[PDB]
Design a protein around this ligand. Structure first.
Ligand SMILES: O=C(N[C@@H]1c2ccccc2-c2c(-c3cnc4ccccc4c3)cccc21)c1c(Br)cnc2[nH]cnc12
Length: 207
């Protein structure tokens, strides 16, 4: 397990999201399902030139898994996945410019709900989660676990868990006052309103 520091602005945005009074928190799901669809679009497109890219799994789907006992909501996809370089360096480059523009826009009057237009919709997870664990597997790298409770740092380690084949698991360890996102009725209602036309099957698991 390696520990990394976020740059001042990104830690400032994460703190903005984790704190700040904003009631419309449900938009986090739309954002993560959108990141999942983007990842599925990427692997599917890559496979068009190289079909061996789907040897790691052919099914292209999104699963939404609530767990009342662990107080978690997992968003699972079988997309492109992320390499160690992505988790540490490349996505850090994306998160830097995107944070700058979103912070500029927020000051100018833009809403927290517009986060996805700046390519940092992933951080909207912190509207409902006190900790986010990302389990991911790209064809070109090993299975990794990324994790942050915000607070200015994140960790990356090789993941010893169940092999995923290919894709991403975004585990949301929800805040104690955000357990409504564990209810079937609530998740269904959010999926219909914001994510009804995603081009991949979304299965809402139950308990
Ligand atoms: O959205 C995706 N990734 C996320 C994303 C988007 C934009 C900017 C950063 C990140 C990020 C970081 C991160 C965040 N901040 C950082 C800041 C500094 C350094 C490294 C950092 C790393 C860590 C884990 C996951 C993601 C994503 C991808 Br792609 C592929 N398949 C998926 N399926 C579902 N989601 C995804």
């Amino acid at each position: 397990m390696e520990t990394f520091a976020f740059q001042a602005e990104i830690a400032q945005l994460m703190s903005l999201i984790i704190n700040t009074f904003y009631s419309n928190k449900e938009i986090f799901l739309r954002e993560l399902i959108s990141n999942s669809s983007d990842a599925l679009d990427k692997i599917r497109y890559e496979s068009l030139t190289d079909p061996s890219k789907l040897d790691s799994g052919k099914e292209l789907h999104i699963n939404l898994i609530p767990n009342k006992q662990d107080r978690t909501l997992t968003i699972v996809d079988t997309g492109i996945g992320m390499t160690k370089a992505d988790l540490i360096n490349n996505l850090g480059t994306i998160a830097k410019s995107g944070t700058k523009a979103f912070m500029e826009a927020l000051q100018a009057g833009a809403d927290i709900s517009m986060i996805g237009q700046f390519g940092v919709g992933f951080y909207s997870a912190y509207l409902v989660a006190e900790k986010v664990t990302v389990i991911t597997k790209h064809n070109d790298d090993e299975q990794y676990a990324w994790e942050s409770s915000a607070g200015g740092s994140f960790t990356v380690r090789t993941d010893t868990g169940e092999p995923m084949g290919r894709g991403t698991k975004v585990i949301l360890h929800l805040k104690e006052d955000q357990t409504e996102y564990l209810e079937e009725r609530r998740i269904k209602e959010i999926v219909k309103k914001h994510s009804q036309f995603i081009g991949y099957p979304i299965t809402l698991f139950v308990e």
